[PDB]
Amino acid sequence: AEQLKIEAVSKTGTTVSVNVRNVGEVPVKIASAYVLNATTLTMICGGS
Amino acid sequence: EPIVAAVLLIVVAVIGAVLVYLWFSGYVTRATSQAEQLSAAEQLKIEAVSKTGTTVSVNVRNVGEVPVKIASAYVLNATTLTMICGGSLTSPQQIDPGTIQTINVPGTCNLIAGARYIVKVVTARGTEAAATFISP
Amino acid sequence: EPIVAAVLLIVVAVIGAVLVYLWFSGYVTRATSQAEQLSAAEQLKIEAVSKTGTTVSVNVRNVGEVPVKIASAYVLNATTLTMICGGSLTSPQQIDPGTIQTINVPGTCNLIAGARYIVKVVTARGTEAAATFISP
Amino acid sequence: EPIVAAVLLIVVAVIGAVLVYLWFSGYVTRATSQAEQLSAAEQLKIEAVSKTGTTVSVNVRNVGEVPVKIASAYVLNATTLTMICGGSLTSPQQIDPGTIQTINVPGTCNLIAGARYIVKVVTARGTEAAATFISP
Amino acid sequence: EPIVAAVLLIVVAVIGAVLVYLWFSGYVTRATSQAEQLSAAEQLKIEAVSKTGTTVSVNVRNVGEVPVKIASAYVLNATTLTMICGGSLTSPQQIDPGTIQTINVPGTCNLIAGARYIVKVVTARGTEAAATFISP
């Protein structure tokens, strides 16, 4: 099983920067990031 | 000779396992999605009410993030939970998030000034919001 | 021969468990963080009111630290919770934290000097603030 | 040839599953309904107490909707939770809902005027009701 | 022939269930008892404080019943939660239940007469107790 957590996020202009923490013990690869709208599960920006 | 039958039985069992896997994936997906999208909840609140003759007008805002539809309104008597007037609305009214709408209690019911009355509105999905007011 | 079917069943169960874990992580994340974000509270206060002819002007101060949008204003009658004038504003007004804004009650409603009135402002999110004044 | 054994094993599994289902239904029914009934609550309250010589008389009011049986009564010392007199009643007394009964503390115990005394009654099911009084 | 494989599979499943039982008992026991013991709560209160030159002496009395170790002491500024002096003590001091001991703020920090200061002491387990005084 795999565990991830994001500690904090920051916004600079129109760019979103996210810090990701691996509480697991195995190497982790990040594939994509999204910005989801509330209660509709529809992406605004993101991709591979 | 039994070896051939055993191999065929193994093949049959493998095919059955593949079928079970296919159905299991489909079912877990559909049931999980159903549970997840029933998980969401809706919020309503009525700010103020007004009386014009024998007609009651109610203002409802959807403070949630999803649209909600108003389907019925009642005027309940206090401490007995018995309706005096109400029923299904002629046409359901849709309330956009962050907006307001006016809802009128269906039918015509007399009221007594200075009496205790509960005005109640119910959503299409079933969320309940209400308040009380003193009849003029 | 049943051993092969058992191994396939174990593999199917493991894959199903992985899928359940994936959705469970996604759901706990989204719902838990939504609850955390909606846990926040919002503060408003109206400093003073002024009457010009038949128009009521109210100054609303954002004593909170989050942006606020004003949606409606009312003039409530005493102890009957029935509005005399009010409704949705033409365009919502945004109030920055630590700042002040002026809000006009929609429409035109006459008043009686020395009578009791409750002026009330409501946010887009539903936060309620009010006060009373003596009509000139 | 192994096919016959496989079919027999399938039949045996079917019969075992049927038996497991039968017991499962029976057990879930009995235990679930036992929990459902035991979830109910029991309410008692004592209206007033009176002392005649060395006998303590207590009136117990059944505010609940279920019959109640009184099995024991005590006279507890203040702040130490140590009994002075009490025990099982000679015969349990039944108190109908909406009615009242008189309960006498078992045995005879001397008392001191102006002292802190706790009179306590316990139901057959275990519900606790009590009060304090100043001995004359 | 599949019957033998089925019997061996049943035996393997039984052994696995026994192992699961063993670990489950052990783990539920250890985690349950850990939660039970960490459920306990700890109490501190400081009776009075005294100032000699630039050294602050605090008397700590355990109203609790368990042994306590004092590990740090601070002098916090008013309403800004910023320490002026403090740190880990050179050697933690054990204070017996029902007794009192003297704790000195580590290091040397100047004071201003008639100023608003908060003196604070923390346990080895993290329990917090403090009070305020007028600096002479």
**CA–CA separation, C103 vs D71, rounded Å?**
69
**CA–CA separation, E18 vs E23, rounded Å?**
9
Contact residues on chain A for B64, CB-CB shorter than 8 A = 39
Resolution in A: 4.3
> Minimal Cα–Cα distance from B64 to chain A, Å?
9
> Which residue numbers of B have CB closer than 8 Å to D's CBs?
1-2, 5-6, 9
Contact residues on chain B for A42, CB-CB shorter than 8 A = none
**CA–CA separation, B67 vs B125, rounded Å?**
11
- Please name which of D44, D46, D47 lies closest in space to residue D65, comparing C-alpha atoms: D44
- The total number of residues written for chain B in this structure: 136
Which chains does chain B touch, 3 or more C-beta pairs < 8 A?
A, C, D
Q: Is there a contact between B119 and B132 (Cβ–Cβ < 8 Å)?
A: yes
C27 vs A2, A23, B37, E56, CA distance in Å? 16, 19, 10, 53
> Minimal Cα–Cα distance from C64 to chain A, Å?
22
> Minimal Cα–Cα distance from C4 to chain B, Å?
7
The conformation of residue B97, written as its DSSP 8-state character, comes to B
Q: Closest-CA residue in chain C for B132?
A: C81
Contact residues on chain A for B66, CB-CB shorter than 8 A = 39-40
Q: In what order do the strands lie in the sheet with E100-104?
A: E45-52, E55-61, E100-104
- Which two structure tokens, joined as six digits, stand for B62? 């959807």
Q: Is there a contact between D103 and D94 (Cβ–Cβ < 8 Å)?
A: no
**CA–CA separation, B61 vs C89, rounded Å?**
13
Pairing between strand B44-52 and A33-36? unpaired
Q: Closest-CA residue in chain B for C4?
A: B10
Q: Is there a contact between B108 and B85 (Cβ–Cβ < 8 Å)?
A: yes
CA angle centred on C82, ends C78 and C88, rounded to 5°: 120
Nearest by CB to C126, from B10, B45, B134: name it: B45
The dihedral formed by the CA atoms of B90, B96, B102 and B107, expressed in degrees to the nearest 10: 20
**CA–CA separation, C108 vs A45, rounded Å?**
45
Contact: D6, B2; criterion CB under 8 Å: no
Among all chains, which residue has been given the structure tokens 């009380």?
B132
The single-letter code of the amino acid at E69 is: K
Among all chains, which residue has been given the structure tokens 């503390």?
D105
What DSSP string describes B122-135? Answer: EESS--EEEEEEE-
B17 vs B4, C94, C100, E9, E29, CA distance in Å? 20, 60, 68, 18, 38
**Residue D38, φ and ψ in degrees, nearest 5:** -70, -15
Q: Is there a contact between E41 and E66 (Cβ–Cβ < 8 Å)?
A: no
- The total number of residues written for chain A in this structure: 48
- Please name which of C71, A40, C29, C31 lies closest in space to residue B66, comparing C-alpha atoms: A40
**CA–CA separation, E72 vs E86, rounded Å?**
7
- Please name which of B47, B41, B46, B48 lies closest in space to residue B64, comparing C-alpha atoms: B41
Residue E46 makes CB contacts below 8 A (sequence gap 6+) with E58, E59, E60, E61, E119, E121, E129, E130, E131
The string over D50-83, giving b where at least 16 C-beta atoms fall within 10 Å of a residue's C-beta and e elsewhere, is ebeeeebebebbbebeeebebebbbbbeeeeeee
Handedness of CA C84, C87, C89, C92 (dihedral sign): positive
Q: Which helix (H) or strand (E) holds A39?
A: none
Q: Closest-CA residue in chain A for B41?
A: A39
Strand segments, DSSP code E, in C5-127 are 45-52, 55-61, 68-76, 83-95, 100-104, 116-123
**Helix, strand, coil shares of chain E as percentages rounded to 5?**
25, 45, 30
Helix, strand or coil, per DSSP, at residue D18? helix
Q: Is there a contact between E74 and E85 (Cβ–Cβ < 8 Å)?
A: yes
What DSSP string describes C43-62? Answer: --EEEEEEEETTEEEEEEE-
Q: After which residue numbers is chain E interrupted with C–N beyond 2.5 angstroms?
A: none
- Alpha helices per DSSP H over chain A: none
Which chains does chain C touch, 3 or more C-beta pairs < 8 A?
A, B, E
**CA–CA separation, E64 vs E95, rounded Å?**
11
Contact: C21, A1; criterion CB under 8 Å: yes
> Minimal Cα–Cα distance from B91 to chain C, Å?
22
- Please name which of E75, E77, E80 lies closest in space to residue E51, comparing C-alpha atoms: E75
Flag whether A touches E (3+ CB pairs, 8 A cutoff). Answer: no
Q: Closest-CA residue in chain B for A40?
A: B66
The single-letter code of the amino acid at C57 is: S
Phi/psi zone of residue E87: left (φ > 0), alpha (ψ -120 to 50 degrees), beta?
Answer: left
> Minimal Cα–Cα distance from A47 to chain C, Å?
18
Method of determination? cryo-EM
Q: Is there a contact between C60 and C46 (Cβ–Cβ < 8 Å)?
A: yes
Q: Is there a contact between C70 and C103 (Cβ–Cβ < 8 Å)?
A: yes
**CA–CA separation, E76 vs E120, rounded Å?**
7
**CA–CA separation, B73 vs B91, rounded Å?**
12
